[PDB]
A paper describes a structure:
The nucleosome remodeling and deacetylase (NuRD) complex is a widely conserved transcriptional co-regulator that harbors both nucleosome remodeling and histone deacetylase activities. RbAp46 and RbAp48 (RBBP7/RBBP4) are ∼50-kDa WD-repeat proteins that were first recognized for their ability to bind the tumor suppressor Rb. RbAp48 has the seven-bladed β-propeller fold common to all WD40-repeat proteins but also displays three non-canonical features: an extended loop (the PP loop; Ref. 16) inserted into blade 6, a long additional N-terminal α-helix that contacts blades 6 and 7, and a single turn of C-terminal helix after blade 7. Our structures reveal that the MTA1 peptide binds in an amphipathic α-helical conformation in the groove on RbAp48 formed by these three structural elements.
Pulldown experiments using additional deletion constructs indicated that MTA1-(656–686) was sufficient to bind RbAp48. The shortest fragment of MTA1 capable of pulling down in vitro translated RbAp48 was MTA1-(656–686), and so to understand the mode of binding we crystallized a complex of RbAp48 bound to MTA1-(656–686). Diffraction data were collected to 2.50 Å resolution and indexed in the space group P21. MTA1 was clearly detectable in the histone H4 binding site on RbAp48 in an mFo − DFc difference map. The KRAARR motif of the MTA1 peptide was observed, but residues N-terminal to this sequence (656–672) did not give clear electron density, suggesting that they were not ordered. Two molecules of RbAp48 and two molecules of MTA1 were found in the asymmetric unit of crystals formed from the complexes of RbAp48 and MTA1-(656–686 and 670–711), whereas one molecule of each polypeptide was observed in the asymmetric unit of RbAp48-MTA1-(670–695). Rcryst and Rfree for each of the final refined models were, respectively, 18.2% and 22.5% for RbAp48-MTA1-(656–686), 18.9% and 23.1% for RbAp48-MTA1-(670–695), and 20.6% and 25.9% for RbAp48-MTA1-(670–711). In all cases the data fitted well to a simple 1:1 binding isotherm, and dissociation constants from representative measurements were 2.3 ± 0.3, 0.05 ± 0.007, and 0.24 ± 0.16 μm for MTA1-(656–686), MTA1-(670–695), and MTA1-(670–711), respectively (standard errors from single curve fits are given). Residues Ile-688 and Leu-690 form a hydrophobic cluster with Leu-672. This cluster, which cannot form in the MTA1-(656–686) peptide, interacts with the aromatic side chain of Phe-30 in RbAp48.
Residue numbers in the entry:
A (entry chain C): 675 to 686
B (entry chain A): 3 to 88, 114 to 411
Write the structure that this text describes.
Amino acid sequence: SETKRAARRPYK
Amino acid sequence: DKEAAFDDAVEERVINEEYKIWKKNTPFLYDLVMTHALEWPSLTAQWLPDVTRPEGKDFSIHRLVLGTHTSDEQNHLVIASVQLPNKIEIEIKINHEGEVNRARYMPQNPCIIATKTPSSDVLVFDYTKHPSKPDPSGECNPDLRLRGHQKEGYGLSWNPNLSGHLLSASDDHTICLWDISAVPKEGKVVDAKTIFTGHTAVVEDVSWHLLHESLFGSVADDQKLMIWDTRSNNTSKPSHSVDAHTAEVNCLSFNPYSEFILATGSADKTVALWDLRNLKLKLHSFESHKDEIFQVQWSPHNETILASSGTDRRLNVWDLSKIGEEQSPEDAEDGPPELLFIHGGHTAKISDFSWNPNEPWVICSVSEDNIMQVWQMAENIYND
């Protein structure tokens, strides 16, 4: 899922 | 000019905005986040191995070796207690001459702690032999003073297979070794048993291999990683020497599950992965960090997980099992596939961190502004 993406984008 | 100050102000804004968006995302990115302002900044952090678990409690008590960094005031070697589920307190403050650059416990007896100061002596403390509350005179009464260096440094590493064998790296281009195994009853000062001189610049870090008692590694501002063997009768030249990075090398870590593997972290903004059986060829370069890296550490629980921290205020977590996976160019923008997590909670240079050895995924990181964070990323990020 895009929970992965958030992990690599702490500042967004 | 007044341009330097417009830049500073913009930069403050940047950091502040970033910290705002980080704070809103915490409930989605973490299972745990604690933040504590220490009295002084700590340059060092290490969890002690012990964990006590009082009856009828919904939490366990863990411990941390920390230090201070203060210019004008009395510095201390510090042990703090942290409560974790199944708050934070200072418990011992020991007078320390100058800031504590690094502090590390001896595995075979973790009451014993070695420190690195701004002076050249490497100190050993037994914290059970000092009062809980420090004498107001402010005198540093360390249990041993280890001599051999001419300058300060950071690297410090106890041999986990030969009790009392301590290695140290220094700005004087030297690695020193001591054996404090057996120390005469009138003896407080201990001279180096061996001094290694293969580097030609500031030696930044040193570490013993975990299985092979004779083996250890070093990294320096000469951009080199050096693999040394204590059995050798030549101390001016390592067994192996590689050109590791395109700038200073500040840190290294041997993988505790993969005896041929280690990582290094550098001012070139990368972490490099290495295989001892063939050092000509770097296995991999982990890219994402935006500025100089100071610390690198393998997970004590998972053989593929590695973390790094430094000057860009971030602590990155990596998983080598994903190296090579393909990705949409949208994901590719955020970083390579082996980047699992960017810890964005600090608003200053991170000075050191330590993976908790009893609670998987829990990390303690400390920054120059005096903040200590104890945190743990959300489970769904590393599992299914």
